[PDB]
């Protein structure tokens, strides 16, 4: 089972950054798995964007970037999408989608990750 | 909102050493940090959840301790693949925030 | 198969009184049922599901019990009830308990 | 905590926890009480049964000591004959499912006692804001 | 202090057992081909995808499937939208005419009884004053002999004239996701070993249920949801020989069933716009339609159900199987749908073995009816129109329905006979895992806190 | 009192009493305002007419001086021209049925006067908790 | 003012004014949210959609800092990243229609901060009226 | 909840006497007591309601007086059937509560 | 007109004490009559259990025994029932159903009573 991301990276600022993360081998409708989008520009630290659970509705973000980012999730294509409107130059980064265990309800999970994709905004 | 601070920052040790990296929070979390290890251009491989019990696929050469706010990572037998990034991350309240960044 | 046994068999008593029949299934927890039958007529029901009587029968008849042990109580033995009385779960029946004028 | 170490805040999400844990996540059972040929008659009578139940509970809440306050104290002391428990064993051991069975026989005396307590306190506020 | 005080808490999660209505949901894929080509497309709404199934802890909820609700109202709901998929179709009251009818032109042998009767009759035309002589092929379970000359009539016409199915509407089951209205919740038990009643010690609350497909069968409930690892029987209770022991197994039995008689559809216009459909000519070679199952999977799955059926009856127990013993036609067979056709297949050749306590294919013949009388009401029939081509469909046998015979006085053989009977037990295996609850908030609990005046 | 010597606490139970008696039993008219083919359309429109009337009275109560309080004082003085009675003759002699006939002409001035009094008091509380 | 020199108090009547002008006439949008074969099914589902929207807004209002108060302050401070405006340009120049587009991206964070502020303040009132 | 106390308790007087039994409450009731007379193994026959007006079928040989909280029963001509129990009972607020019990 | 009470009393503790009171001659659907269940063990005082009105719904008990006792009333058999679950040894008593006048609405009533049933619980 591997998590494949997609999305080309070369764009213009104040525009439509869109990233897709999808699963191969299993499904996104498995219960109790923390989904996370976490970015990192090279030279700078690990920056947290988004995190939710697999089996509810209430979704969470970082408040310092919240007007720029939004997340989405659907199982008809098993897509896990990040949307950025009004991108600055401070989002040229590699990006990671992550499936983490919740540890009170799941001793038997596999802490899956994406490989990270590089988006460069001039 | 809870800030995290990770010390030290830039390290270079010899082989077979025992390195310690602590991190501190802004309010009391008492049970809640996870440790992640990220190599160059790669996905971060998690050391552990809940600061005292480990993940499968990782040996006993890493450890974490502490209680309350200040917590501490200890690597007792340094291997040559350890020159990478490490991060402690909180999960007390939303949003999750990582550490600063360990350049060992 | 599940065999029944009733406690008095033949009984020869007095009117006006109380009488407790006891039946004894061989595995417990059952749905117990009670029947009053006159000689040469239709048997009609007294008690379904171990406790509760039907409509249009007098309230002097009460069934009781649990587990493997079931009582059939009649208080104030009136002149009508000199009959035979059966107890049953589904596909078996008792031998037949008879209450007689003496 | 939250996230990867969470007793789960979901809908009915902590229903087997202890009442100290279920004393926090309390709006999560409130806000999922509204939302939701011959079939539309069944659908509309489901929705008006839902809002009639919610209105009866808002009206039963309001004539006691709290309008919509969601955590509400009052002015009648707690009797020993209802529970005979200590505080620590119900806030540190017992669940709300078991608690609703333990005070099941002691309903419909507490509600009439709240009604008398609130009605006498409202007439006390009436005379106390009258006489000055 | 020691004088504690009551607080009313709102929105305590507790639940109570209650009965209420429910509310449907389906996929988006059912609305792509649109507007009543299958039922319930104008009835109830598309779902939210990925049902928000959230597990609970340290709760023991007492489940029961036999005094359960919601399996009654699916049995009313299917019948109600069955009537709603049969109201705007054409009544067939002008069909009941005296038939002049013969054999189909076939090499008759004396032992085989002919399944096709070729009848010609009078029928009205679009203009009411002209009338036409038309011919059809009919199956012998739909034509009876009224009293040299052999004149026939349709079987329903001394009961009620009845309704053609429209060939717009299909018959395959789309899944229905049952879902909870506002102010109730649905609890799901998720144990493997679970035989129906008592405490389930791991529950999950869900928003909507999973995919349930309403598929009618009398014996052999098919396309059904499997178990987790073993083979489980379930019962109301076993020692009562009135309620059906229903058995559900894990690994399916693939069943191939087919009709090879190649059919031609023919339209006859009854009057104005009443396009009656009949059989036309039979081309190819006239055979008898039949079901097939593989031998080895049948032998091994019957070994698994006699292994898990011996646990309730002692280990020194001889268990054999017969076919059904009587009744009408819809309980001796297993009776099932395939792509718009009704099949009634005589399952004597499956349930016939004993067992002791120490390429390969089974075929079974199958008849075809056309007037059905679904759910055994009085004034209703659904006429199926016939479909082109060789009809072929595969399916998955999952669960069987077994009633005992009353084996008495000490001898340890206990026969089992399949016969389904009631329609609800092909749903109660599909819905044995949920119960509905009503949330009753406003708990009352003491604390050490007094309100300021 | 109650029981064998009771002016009867029933539904509309003391409607001919003096208003000092009807000032106690006041929840008994509030809580019976919720409860309760082609016929289900008539039943459905009966229940949604009931809860639309109850919601209009809750919303008309709420934007005056009280949220759900059921006994509610305010901050506009009482005029002599509306009643010209003393207090003792309306709390010691008169019934509520006759009171709704003595004031029917002076309705829809009191409600607009309450709306101005509550709106000016809300902006006074707004500026008073603003300026500090 | 009113009358012949009035910015019009009607339904939606001052909708392009400055927010200081629309801070007065505020009940005029509240009280027109209640009132209002196969056709009666459409009519009844219109009215129960109306009262379901109104009940969801009353329940969303109530679990924040105000039950029915209609002008309602709270205890979370205002962030510069939401508007970066001065007070005088939004109370002396801007319209509510243009305000709702300026702060449409900053919704569903303010409601989360309202819920945490009210829930922590209610538990602060619980522990403050507990320990005395 | 309102408690009632009935005094005296046990009596045995001669014929033709005049016995008085008082009872007191815990809060002021001012109009509300009823008097009941119970013979041995029988249903209690009511003397009176409202402490000042009698029941039909009972003569004028019984009386009750008082106002407020303390009230008083007086029997002026004792008959031989008066060897029984008597009870005053409140009806001020729910629940109703009787007296303690007379033996006379 | 007479009230007949019924119910045998020789039972085991912590069980199903049930008493019936019924009318013969008249009906229980007559308006404005206070119904009462009042018990008395011999040697002890007159103890109040229950009291209601003939023509309402709201029902009243003594709070000190309220988890044990329940009352019921129905006119299709004209029954007036007392139900005590989880009894102690302090219920060995005679029991009275009582029909009393409300004195502001009824000058013309008949203050009726039950004969009292003695229940002995070992
Ligand atoms: C238990 O579960 C199994 C698993 O699903 C199920 O088997 C399925 O049965 C259905 C019967 O309804 C089968 O569905 C039919 O399949 C044939 C063939 O489909 C294959 O080929 C097409 C390419 O043409 C592929 O796209 C497809 O994926 C398959 O590979 C179709 O021809 C059928 O469609 C016709 O019939 C429908 C009903 O009338 C029409 O709605 C549809 O538009 C098609 O109409 C055609 O025929 C009409 C008359 O002949 C004519 O008027 C039209 O113009 C048009 O020509 C239908 O899709 C399905 O394939 C089976 N699944 C598998 C894997 O084989 C069992 O039925 C189920 N058990 C029970 C009791 O339900
Ligand atoms: C469900 O499915 C099963 C099998 O799939 C069916 O079971 C078999 O059904 C047949 C009847 O349909 C049973 O009977 C056998 O039929 C033979 C047919 O011969 C006919 O024609 C000749 C000449 O025309 C006549 O003489 C004869 O009487 C028949 O009219 C019989 O010949 C068979 O006779 C047997 O016994 C005689 C002596 O007794 C011998 O001479 C024969 O050689 C032969 O051994 C026989 O009677 C058959 O037995 C059934 N099988 C089993 C295992 O019992 C079910 O009928 C079917 N049910 C339904 C409802 O569909
Ligand atoms: C159910 O029962 C119905 C009766 O109601 C049967 O219908 C008839 O079946 C027979 C047998 O096929 C048909 O007879 C054949 O008719 C062919 C065409 O005739 C039609 O067209 C001519 C004009 O060209 C008309 O005059 C005539 O009336 C018909 O309308 C003939 O060609 C056939 O001749 C055969 O033999 C010659 C010999 O040289 C060959 O050269 C030919 O190729 C051919 O093989 C024959 O006479 C009859 O027409 C049918 N009637 C109707 C109304 O359809 C059904 O057959 C039966 N069902 C089944 C399934 O068999
Ligand atoms: C359908 O299935 C079974 C078998 O026919 C039957 O279920 C039985 O239910 C009762 C209780 O639900 C079980 O009884 C238990 O058994 C022990 C034996 O030591 C007893 O102590 C108890 O039985 C009595 O106790 C109850 C109080 O606890 C009484 O209220 C009651 O009257 C019981 O008689 C204990 O509960 C019993 O074991 C099962 N049987 C099996 C085989 O598990 C059920 O009643 C059947 N239904 C019908 C309609 O036939
Ligand atoms: C039903 O399930 C819930 C969900 O798990 C459960 O709540 C939690 O249970 C666990 C254990 O079952 C509790 O964890 C321990 O509780 C004990 C006493 O309560 C504490 O002493 C423990 O503290 C230890 O751990 C610390 C850090 O590891 C040490 O520093 C310390 O020295 C102790 O050794 C530990 O917390 C947990 O507390 C509860 N949760 C809450 C909020 O109380 C619940 O108990 C289950 N209910 C039943 C009836 O089984
Ligand atoms: C379709 O409709 C036609 C038209 O009515 C039917 O034809 C008619 O059938 C009747 C039988 O009830 C015939 O009557 C009989 O005629 C014979 C002589 O042919 C006579 O000897 C008998 O005593 C009897 O009266 C009638 O003649 C016939 N009509 C014509 C014009 O000949 C026909 O039966 C219907 N069915 C089919 C399959 O065609
Ligand atoms: C279930 O299995 C048994 C075992 O074979 C079936 O019994 C057999 O059924 C056939 C069909 O009825 C009997 O054949 C005879 O055929 C002639 C032909 O017309 C008919 O006239 C006879 O009356 C009889 O039907 C066969 O004798 C019979 N065997 C026994 C021992 O009775 C049974 O029919 C099966 N049940 C079903 C519903 O298929
Ligand atoms: C035409 O069909 C009839 C029945 O519709 C057949 O007639 C009889 O069928 C039975 C079968 O149950 C046989 O036992 C009889 O021997 C048949 N009678 C005759 C005279 O054959 C008939 O076989 C079919 N074919 C023909 C040419 O008439
Ligand atoms: C269904 O199975 C459960 C457990 O698998 C049974 O429940 C208990 O089983 C144990 C094991 O023998 C017994 O000792 C208990 O007495 C059973 N308890 C109860 C309440 O039954 C259960 O009996 C089975 N029920 C049926 C109908 O098969
Ligand atoms: C039912 O039919 C399917 C296909 O219609 C059969 O599946 C085939 O089985 C043969 C035998 O092993 C294989 O060679 C084919 O490759 C299979 N094809 C497919 C598409 O699966 C199936 O075997 C039939 N069932 C039975 C019991 O024979
Ligand atoms: C049903 O069972 C019977 C016996 O119980 C089977 O009949 C025997 O089948 C074997 C297998 O060929 C033969 O060797 C015997 O001679 C048969 N005996 C009789 C009396 O027929 C029968 O085969 C079974 N049915 C099916 C469809 O398998
Ligand atoms: C079943 O019948 C249909 C029609 O009766 C047959 O379809 C024909 O197939 C050939 C193949 O080339 C076509 O040329 C014809 O045009 C088709 N007929 C029609 C009317 O369109 C079909 O072959 C038959 N199936 C089998 C298995 O025999
Ligand atoms: C019928 O049985 C077959 C196998 O006996 C089922 O096929 C498997 O279904 C799962 C779920 O989609 C797939 O992951 C497997 O790959 C399938 N097996 C094969 C060999 O392809 C099938 O789902 C069952 N149900 C239906 C409706 O056909
Ligand atoms: C409990 O209630 C009863 C009556 O309701 C009362 O007599 C008793 O004093 C109360 N006890 C406490 C501690 O409140
Ligand atoms: C509460 O009432 C039930 C019956 O209503 C009874 O069985 C149970 O014993 C009571 N609870 C307690 C703690 O006695
Ligand atoms: C019967 O078989 C089971 C295993 O299937 C075994 O556990 C049990 O002990 C056996 N009983 C006897 C009496 O041999
Ligand atoms: C009564 O109202 C009128 C106008 O509304 C006013 O002029 C008058 O002063 C008022 N009197 C009192 C006593 O409020
Ligand atoms: C109030 O108005 C009615 C008509 O609306 C009128 O007849 C009546 O006289 C008025 N009341 C008084 C006290 O004048
Ligand atoms: C605004 O919010 C962010 C995070 O929500 C915080 O870091 C910042 O300090 C806030 N600023 C003000 C002025 O409130
Ligand atoms: C608010 O969001 C929209 C898109 O949702 C975006 O186009 C717009 O620029 C944002 N507003 C501001 C002030 O950036």
Residue that is written with structure tokens 């061989």 in the block:
C26
C-beta atoms of H98 and I103 within 8 A: no
* Rounded distance between C-alpha atoms, residue I71 and residue I82, angstroms: 5
Distance CA(E449)–CA(E446), nearest Å, equals 9
Is the bond leading into A87 cis (omega within 30 degrees of zero)? no
CA-to-CA separations, E78 to E21, E81, E225, E427, F37, in angstroms, rounded: 14, 5, 19, 11, 19
Cα gap E19→E69, rounded to integer Å: 6
F34 CB near a chain G CB, below 8 Å? no
Place of tokens 């006979």: E417
| Gap from H92 CA to chain F (nearest CA, Å) | 5
Q: Are E116 and E95 in contact (CB under 8 A)?
A: no
What is the spatial distance between Cα D42 and Cα E20, in angstroms, rounded to a whole number?
11
- Give the number of other Cβ atoms within 10 Å of residue F41's Cβ: 16
Determine phi and psi for A21, rounding to 5 degrees.
Answer: -125, 130
Omega of the bond prior to E368 within 30 degrees of 0, cis? no
**What is the least distance, in Å, from the CA of D132 to any CA of chain G?**
26
How many whole angstroms from E293 Cα to the centroid of ligand 1?
21
CA distances from G131 to C23, C45, D89, E452, G121 (A): 63, 66, 20, 12, 15
Rounded to whole angstroms, how far apart are CA atoms D127 and D129? Answer: 5
Chain G residues in contact with E11 by the CB 8 A cut-off are none
Check if the beta carbon of residue D27 is closer than 8 Å to that of residue D70.
yes
I109-122 in b/e form (b: 16+ CB < 10 A) is bebbbbbbbebebe
SS3 call for G104 = coil
Residue C56, by phi and psi: left (phi above 0), alpha (psi -120 to 50) or beta?
Answer: left
CB distance A31–E28 less than 8 Å?
no
Rounded Cα distance between H25 and H92, Å, is 10
In total, chain B counts a number of residues equal to: 104
**Who contacts B56 (Cβ-Cβ below 8 Å, separation ≥6)?**
none
Classified as helix, coil or strand, G100 is helix
Torsion angles phi and psi, residue E347, rounded to 5: -95, 40
Q: Which among H72, A82, B48 is positioned nearest to H62, based on CA atoms?
A: H72
Give the span between the Cα atoms of B59 and E424, in whole angstroms.
Answer: 56
Residues after which a C–N gap over 2.5 Å breaks chain G: 36
The technique by which this structure was obtained is cryo-EM
Q: Cβ contacts of residue E121 below 8 Å, gap of 6+?
A: E97, E98, E99, E100, E133, E134, E135, E136
CB atoms within 10 A of CB C5: 13
Report how far residue B102's alpha carbon sits from residue B11's, in angstroms, rounded to the nearest whole number.
Answer: 8
Is the Cβ pair D2, B31 closer than 8 Å? no
CA of E305 to the centre of ligand 11 (A): 22
Q: How close does chain H come to F52, measured CA to CA in Å? A: 36
Q: Are strands A93-101 and A112-113 parallel, antiparallel or unpaired?
A: antiparallel
Measured distance CA(E235)–CA(E238) in Å, rounded: 6
Pick from G94, G105, G106 the residue to mutate for probing ligand 20's pocket: most ligand atoms within 8 Å of its CB: G105
**Which residues, 6 or more positions from A13, have their beta carbon under 8 angstroms from its beta carbon?**
A87, A88, A89, A121, A122
In angstroms, the CA D62 to CA D55 distance is 10
Report the C-alpha gap between E309 and D53 in whole angstroms: 47
- Dist CA G18 CA F84 (whole Å): 45
Give the separation between CA E215 and CA G19, rounded to whole angstroms: 61
Q: What is the resolution of this structure in A?
A: 4.3
Beta bridge partners of H7: H22
Contact A44, B100 (CB under 8 A): no
Distance CA H46, CA H44 (A): 6
Q: Which residue is listed with tokens 């049952």?
A: E178
What is the arrangement of strands in the sheet containing B4-7, beginning at the earlier edge strand? Answer: B4-7, B19-25, B71-75, B62-66
**C-alpha atoms less than 13 angstroms from C-alpha of C29 in its C-beta half-sphere:** 3
- Chains in touch with H (3+ beta-carbon pairs under 8 Å) read F, I
Report d(CA D110, CA D83) in Å as an integer. 13
Q: Is I17 helix (H, G, I), strand (E, B) or coil?
A: strand
Tell me which residue has tokens 């899956």.
A112
What size, in residues, is chain A?
122
Burial state string for E293-316 with b = 16 or more CB within 10 A and e = fewer than 16 = beeebbeebbeebbeebeeeeeee
Structure tokens at H51: 């402490």
DSSP B82: G
Pocket lining: E258 vs ligand 1, CB cutoff 6 Å = no
Q: State the maximum Cα–Cα separation within chain C, in Å, rounded to a whole number.
A: 38
CA atoms of E278 and E265, how far apart (whole Å): 6
DSSP output for G7-53: PP-STTTTTTSBHHHHTT--TTTTSTTS----HHHHHHHHHHHHHHH
Q: How far apart are CA E349 and CA E322, in angstroms?
A: 9
**Which residues, at least 6 apart from E398, have a Cβ–Cβ distance to it below 8 Å?**
E221, E222, E223, E224, E225, E226, E248, E249, E252
In total, chain E counts a number of residues equal to: 453
Give the whole-angstrom CA distance, residue B78 versus residue B86: 14
Q: Going by C-beta distance under 8 Å and a sequence separation of 6 or more, which residues neighbour residue E453?
A: D75, D121
CB–CB of I46 and H55 under 8 A? no
| Tokens matching residue D36 | 């939701």
Listed residue (E364, E433, E94) closest to E219, CA to CA = E364
Residue pair B100/B42 in contact (Cβ under 8 Å)? The answer is no
| Ligand 5 pocket residues where CB is under 6 Å | B 31, 67; D 7, 16-18, 21; E 57-58
The candidate with the shortest Cα–Cα distance to B67, out of B22, B8, B15, is B22
Measured distance CA(D97)–CA(G85) in Å, rounded: 51
| Cα(E101)–Cα(E105) distance, integer angstroms | 12
> How many other C-beta atoms can be found within 10 angstroms of the C-beta atom of residue E203?
23
Angle at B102 between CA B100 and CA B103, to 5 degrees: 130
Question: How many CB atoms neighbour CB F103 within 10 A?
Answer: 11
The two tokens of residue F7 are 């002016």
Task: Give chain B's end-to-end CA distance (angstroms, integer).
Answer: 28
Residue C37, beta-bridge partner list: C43, C84
User: Does the C-beta of G79 come closer than 6 Å to ligand 19?
Assistant: yes
E145 φ, ψ (degrees, to nearest 5): -95, 115
Among the partner-chain residues G35, G70, G73, the one whose CB lies closest to the CB of F129 is G73
DSSP secondary structure, F69-102, as one string:
-SS---S-PPPTTTT---SHHHHTT-BHHHHHHH
Q: E203 preceded by cis ω (within 30°)?
A: no
Decide if E436 contacts G115 (C-beta within 8 A). no
How far apart are the CA of F35 and the nearest CA of chain G, in angstroms?
17
Residues of chain F with C-beta less than 8 angstroms from the C-beta of H34: 4
- The structure tokens listed for G71 are 């002008």
Minimal-distance CA residue of chain D relative to I62: D109
Buried (b) or exposed (e) across F111-122, using 16+ Cβ within 10 A?
eeebeebbbeeb
Angle (CA) I14 I17 I23, round 5° = 170
Report the Cα–Cα distance between both ends of chain I, in Å, rounded: 34
Cβ neighbors of E288 (< 8 A, separation 6 or more) are E115, E365, E366, E367
Dig out the tokens for I33 from the structure.
């009559």
DSSP SS3 for H4: strand
CA–CA distance, G74 with G117 (Å, rounded to integer): 8
Give the C-alpha separation, E98 to E96, whole Å.
7
**Nearest alpha carbon to residue D63 among D120, D4, D132, D118:** D118
In degrees to the nearest 10, what's the CA dihedral of E334, E338, E342, E348? -20
Alpha-carbon dihedral E50, E54, E60, E66, rounded to 10 degrees: -10
F56 touches chain D (CB under 8 A): no
Phi, psi of A116, deg, nearest 5 = 85, 125
Quick one: which of A44, A22, A18, A25 has its CA closest to A35?
A22
For residue A78, count other CB atoms closer than 10 A to its CB.
16
Prior bond to F55 cis, omega within 30? no
Q: Are H63 and H76 in contact (CB under 8 A)?
A: yes
Q: What's chain E look like in SS3?
A: CCCCEEEEECCCCCEEECCCCCECCECCHHHCCCCCCCCCCCCCCECCCCCCCEECCCCCEEECCCCCCCHHHHHHHHHHHHHHCCCCCCCCHHHCCCEEEEECCCCCCCCCCCCEEEEEEEEECCCCCCEEEEEEEEECCCEEECCCCCEEEEHHHHCCCCEECCCCCCCCCCCECCECCECEEEEEECCCCCCCCEEECCEEEECECCCECCCCCCCCEECCCCCCCCCEEECCCCCCCCCCEEEEEEEEEEEEEEECCECCEEEEECCCCCEEEEECCCECCCCCCEEEEEHHHHHHHHHHHHHCCHHHCCCCCEEEECCCCCCCHHHHCEEEECCCCEEEECHHHCCCEEECCCCCEEEEEEEECCEECCCCCCCCCEECCCCCCCEEEEEEEEEEEEEECCCCCCCCECCEEECCCCHHHHCCCCCCCEEEEEECCCEEEEECCCCCC
Q: Tell me the three state secondary structure of residue D125.
A: helix
The crossing angle, in degrees rounded to 10, of helices G39-62 and D39-62 is 30
CB H49 within 8 A of CB H55: yes
Say if CB E58 and CB D16 are below 8 A apart: yes
Distance CA E452, CA D73 (A): 9
Q: Which CATH architecture has domain C1-102?
A: Sandwich (2.60)
Nearest to H42 by CA among H2, H92, H81, H90: H81
Cα separation of I110 and I122, whole Å? 37
If DSSP codes are grouped into helix, strand and coil, which group holds residue G99? helix
Nearest 5 degrees, angle CA A71-CA A74-CA A77? Answer: 125
Residue D24 near chain B (CB below 8 Å): no
- Nearest listed ligand to the Cα of residue F105: 18
Taking the C-alpha atoms of residue G51 and residue I13, their distance in angstroms, rounded to an integer, is 54
DSSP bridge pairs for H38: H85
Rounded Cα distance between A34 and D12, Å, is: 19
Give how far the C-alpha of residue F6 lies from the chain's centroid of Cα atoms, to the nearest Å. Answer: 24
Task: Provide the residue ranges of all domains of chain C, joining segments of one domain with +.
Answer: 1-102
Q: How many Cβ atoms sit within 10 Å of the Cβ of residue E330? A: 17
* DSSP conformation class of A64: G
Strands I33-40, I93-101: pairing is antiparallel
Query: Measured between alpha carbons, how far is H101 from G77 in angstroms, rounded to an integer?
Result: 69
Q: What is each CA distance from E333 to E351, E372, E381, in whole angstroms? A: 12, 14, 19
Q: How far away, in angstroms, is E90 Cα from ligand 6 center? A: 29
């Amino acid at each position: 089972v591997q998590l494949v991301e997609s999305g080309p990276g070369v764009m213009k600022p104040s525009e439509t950054l869109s990233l897709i993360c999808a699963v191969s081998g299993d499904t996104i409708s498995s219960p109790y798995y923390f989904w996370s989008w976490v970015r990192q520009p090279r030279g700078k630290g690990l920056e947290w964007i988004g995190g939710l659970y697999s089996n509810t509705m209430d979704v969470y973000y970082n408040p310092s970037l919240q007007s720029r980012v939004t997340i989405s999730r659907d199982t008809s294509k098993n897509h896990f999408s990040l949307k950025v409107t009004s991108v600055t130059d401070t989002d040229t980064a590699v990006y990671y989608c992550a499936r983490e265990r919740v540890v009170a309800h799941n001793y038997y999970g596999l802490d899956l990750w994406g490989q990270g994709v590089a988006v460069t905004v001039s | 909102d809870i800030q995290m601070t990770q010390s030290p920052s830039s390290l270079s040790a010899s082989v077979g050493d025992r390195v310690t990296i602590t991190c501190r929070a802004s309010q009391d979390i008492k049970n809640s940090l996870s440790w992640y290890q990220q190599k160059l251009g790669k996905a971060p491989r998690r050391l552990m959840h809940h600061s005292s019990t480990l993940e499968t696929g990782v040996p006993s050469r890493f450890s974490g301790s502490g209680y309350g706010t200040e917590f501490t990572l200890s690597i007792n037998s340094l291997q040559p693949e350890d020159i990478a990034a490490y991060y402690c991350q909180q999960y007390e309240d939303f949003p999750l925030t990582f550490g600063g960044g360990t350049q060992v | 198969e599940i065999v029944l046994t009733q406690s008095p068999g033949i009984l020869s008593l007095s009117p006006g009184e109380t009488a407790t029949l006891f039946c004894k299934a061989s595995q417990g927890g059952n749905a117990m049922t009670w029947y009053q039958k006159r000689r040469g007529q239709v048997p009609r029901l007294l008690i379904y599901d171990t406790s509760r009587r039907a409509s249009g029968v007098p309230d002097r008849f009460v069934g009781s019990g649990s587990g493997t042990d079931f009582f059939l109580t009649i208080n104030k033995l009136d002149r009508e009830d000199f009959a035979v009385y059966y107890c049953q779960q589904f596909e078996f029946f008792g031998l037949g308990s008879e209450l007689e004028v003496h | 905590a939250v996230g990867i170490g969470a007793v789960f805040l979901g809908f009915l999400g902590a229903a087997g926890s202890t009442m100290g844990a279920a004393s926090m996540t309390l709006t999560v059972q409130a806000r999922n009480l509204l939302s939701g040929t011959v079939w539309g008659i069944k659908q509309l009578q489901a929705r008006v049964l839902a809002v009639e139940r919610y209105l009866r509970d808002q009206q039963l809440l309001g004539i006691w000591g709290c309008s919509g306050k969601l955590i509400c104290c009052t002015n009648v002391p707690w009797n020993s004959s209802w529970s005979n428990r200590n505080l620590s064993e119900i806030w540190d051991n017992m669940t709300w499912l078991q608690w609703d069975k333990e005070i099941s026989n002691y309903t419909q005396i507490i509600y009439g006692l709240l009604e008398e307590s609130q009605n006498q306190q409202e007439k006390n506020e009436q005379d106390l804001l009258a006489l000055d | 202090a020691e004088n504690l005080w009551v607080t009313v808490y709102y929105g305590v999660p507790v639940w109570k057992d209650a009965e209420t209505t429910l509310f449907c949901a389906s996929d988006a894929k059912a609305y792509e081909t649109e507007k009543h080509n299958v039922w319930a497309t104008h009835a109830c709404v598309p779902t939210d995808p990925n049902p928000q199934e959230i597990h609970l802890e340290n709760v023991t909820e007492e489940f029961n499937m036999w005094k359960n609700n919601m399996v009654e109202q699916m049995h009313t709901d299917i019948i109600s939208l069955w009537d709603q998929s049969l109201k705007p179709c054409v009544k067939l009251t002008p069909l009941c005419v005296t038939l002049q009818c013969t054999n189909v032109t076939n090499n008759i042998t004396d032992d085989m009884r002919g399944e096709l009767k070729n009848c010609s009759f009078n029928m009205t035309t679009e203009l009411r004053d002209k009338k036409q002589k038309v011919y059809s092929l009919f199956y012998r379970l739909d034509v009876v002999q009224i009293n040299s000359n052999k004149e026939y009539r349709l079987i329903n016409c001394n009961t009620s004239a009845c309704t053609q199915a429209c060939p717009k509407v299909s018959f395959e089951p789309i899944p229905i996701h049952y879902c909870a209205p506002a102010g109730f919740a649905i609890l799901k038990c998720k144990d493997k070993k679970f035989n129906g009643t008592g405490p389930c010690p791991s529950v999950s609350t869900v928003q909507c249920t999973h995919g349930i497909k309403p598929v009618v069968s009398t014996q052999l409930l098919l396309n059904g949801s499997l178990a987790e690892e073993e083979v489980m029987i379930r019962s109301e209770n076993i020692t009562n020989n009135a309620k059906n022991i229903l058995v559900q197994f894990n690994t399916p039995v693939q069943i191939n069933c087919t009709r090879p008689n190649n059919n031609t559809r023919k339209s006859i216009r009854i009057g104005p716009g009443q396009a009656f459909y009949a059989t036309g000519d039979i081309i190819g070679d006239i055979r008898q339609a039949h079901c097939n199952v593989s031998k080895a999977t049948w032998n091994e799955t019957l070994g698994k159900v006699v292994k898990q059926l011996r646990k309730h009856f002692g280990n020194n127990t001889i268990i054999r199987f017969a076919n059904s013993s009587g009744g009408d036609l819809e309980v001796t067979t297993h009776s099932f749908n395939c792509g718009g056709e009704f099949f009634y297949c005589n399952t004597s050749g499956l349930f016939n073995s004993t067992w002791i306590s120490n390429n390969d294919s089974i075929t079974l013949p199958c008849r075809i009816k056309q007037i059905i009388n679904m759910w055994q009401r009085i004034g209703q029939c659904m006429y199926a129109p016939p479909i082109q081509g060789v009809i072929r469909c595969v399916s998955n046998i999952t669960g069987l329905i077994l009633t005992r015979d009353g084996g008495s006085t000490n001898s340890t053989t206990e026969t089992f006979r399949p016969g389904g009977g009631d329609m609800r037990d092909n749903w109660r295996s599909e819905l044995y895992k949920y119960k509905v609850v009503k949330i009753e908030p406003l708990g009352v609990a003491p604390t050490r806190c007094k309100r300021r005046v």
